[PDB]
Design a binder for these strands. Sequence first.
RNA 1: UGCUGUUGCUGUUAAAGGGUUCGUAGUUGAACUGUGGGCU
RNA 2: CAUGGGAUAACAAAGGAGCUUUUUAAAGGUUGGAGAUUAUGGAGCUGUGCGACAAAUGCUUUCCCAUCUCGGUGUGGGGUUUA
Lengths: 199, 38, 129, 143, 93
Amino acid sequence: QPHLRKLRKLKRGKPSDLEESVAKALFELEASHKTLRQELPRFHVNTVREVKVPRSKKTVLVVFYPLRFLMLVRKVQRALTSELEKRHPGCLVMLVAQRQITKRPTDVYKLQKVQRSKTSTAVFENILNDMIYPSDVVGRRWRCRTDGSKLMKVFLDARDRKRIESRLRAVAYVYKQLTHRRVSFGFMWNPKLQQVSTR
Amino acid sequence: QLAEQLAAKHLRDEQNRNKARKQELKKREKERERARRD
Amino acid sequence: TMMSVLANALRTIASAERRGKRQVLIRPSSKVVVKFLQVMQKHGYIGEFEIIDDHRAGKIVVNLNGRLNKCGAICPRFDCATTDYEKWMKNILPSRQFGFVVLTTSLGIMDHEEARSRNTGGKVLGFFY
Amino acid sequence: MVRMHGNGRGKASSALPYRRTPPAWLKIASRNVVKMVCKSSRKGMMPSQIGMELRDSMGIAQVKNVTGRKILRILKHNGLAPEIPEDLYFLVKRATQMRKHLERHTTDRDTKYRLILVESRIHRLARYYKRVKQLPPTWKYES
Amino acid sequence: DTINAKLQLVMKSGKYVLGTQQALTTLRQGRSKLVVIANNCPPIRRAEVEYYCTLSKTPIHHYSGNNLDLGTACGKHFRTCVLSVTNVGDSDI
RNA sequence: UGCUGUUGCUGUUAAAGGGUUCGUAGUUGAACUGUGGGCU
RNA sequence: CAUGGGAUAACAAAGGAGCUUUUUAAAGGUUGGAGAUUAUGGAGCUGUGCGACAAAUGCUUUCCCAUCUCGGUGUGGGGUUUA
Ligand SMILES: [Mg+2]
Ligand SMILES: [Mg+2]
Ligand SMILES: [Mg+2]
Ligand SMILES: [Mg+2]
Ligand SMILES: [Mg+2]
């Protein structure tokens, strides 16, 4: 069937129940939507994973795609994200590129040859940018409490508080499931002068 | 002698690059055909 | 020019404590400086502190309770075997009942009391009491 | 200009922003930006001047934030980099004009003093560029 | 000076010829686009070159230095009295 | 005898900063690739 | 001299445009032992086709040559895609 072409060739054999449902939606949109019809033909996904966020009603759909299409996805991410939501009520979709990490070497000579975009610091930062893409990070702080813990907080612009407020609980939980790191969010009106906004 | 050896290596590398690109371009022409053969 | 980031940071903290300030700002930051602060924080000599990111060498804002008397760096970073601990305690510490010497060892950064228990030597970084 | 060779202590400079994403209203593709950079180079502009033309009249605040690479990197890939680095070129030009002035005004001792400082700056800079192989070995500055 | 900047562009991108005899040959043909003469030129030789430019309607520039300066401004290590640029590349003039 | 001072001296007026710059050996030299996670 | 540890450092190098993998098929270029002669094949060498899977950066590319209202979402209203 033609819609299976939207998957990686490995998974065209026995797709999972989530994979082909997304594949049908992508195939149908590639011929109907006005702006998606010239980017989608070159696009195909790797896998789709389901995450259940505790203490919540909505569930999260995570879609993995090859890093080749990073610029392709960024161009149509807004339309693609909203379009998939309608086909899948009661769910939230995030598009994440699949990246690999080289473990930190112990020898000095090897450390000089590491490709910097494959370090865990760089990779985890880009994963976070994928989950909030229309918005961007305007500040970042680390809080070191007396008990010895260290908590990281990320500040977003207050101009787009209305759009992304509902999704922050889901984003924080999924980010922990992929990186095993804790994150917290806040908003800044006038980030130039570092003014945080309370409600 | 050293310069001649280096030049030979350069020529071999360029030939391999061109051959790989040609094979890649020939591939996916079949995939394009299958898209028109649905 | 500025040759030692650690020496610059510790002198800033000691000066603020002597004048009785409640907070102090530190720049530039470093991973060695952060490790040193956590050692002091664990024994209760400083309060909460916070790291601010600016795509460069960052900055630190630390809250001070009134418990710190002095902190300082040792330059150059002399080597210290396990048998030299009594020598350094005798020279730069007020008493044998309180105060610490901080070392960098192959096991990490730690105070002299913990290093002795682990039976390891290293290089002297500084002190606080 | 400020600290090396003198007593100046000025601080004037630019401050790059924390947010490195180009604005929404900028609708120029990366390919076209690269074309304009190479076009201005053939016209005869130096990398410093190229970046100011785009900043002043094209809305491009930082070329790196749009294309991913710096201006001099773009020229090197297209075979348009200058023979010697730009800052070394301007220092040599200044010393040449000082020497031409001094061959008529032989008693301008203030200018003679400034010529010593500029030539010391040239020799320090040449030593750095030879170590990182941006200059041929045995490159020499001739008075 | 503005003239020196353009000469460097021509010297690296365009085509040119150095010397009075070769410059006159380009003027007898139609390939010459601009002729530059140093101020240290023999008066009878200058008058002959200017006459050729008037007949062929070629723009002519009077350089402000001598034949030593003109040679240095072209990156050469010898003196040139007359310069003729047959091809101008990426330059206004 | 902390009156040879690495630990540990002094240099405004008690003895002692070179008239001012440039500069080679030498000594000294900014940040960054790193919070493992889940169970009772 | 041997060996365990890698936090702080030192030496050396570089100056960043000197920068795919796999599967089939075809083409050529030990004989009783010891001493000579030859041939059939491995393996690797190139150049043809074939199957399968990746790719850290889009070949249903770029380039100029031309020729002619509904749905999902949060609290009856808001914001998103679309019409
Ligand atoms: Mg004594
Ligand atoms: Mg004395
Ligand atoms: Mg005196
Ligand atoms: Mg004096
Ligand atoms: Mg350092």
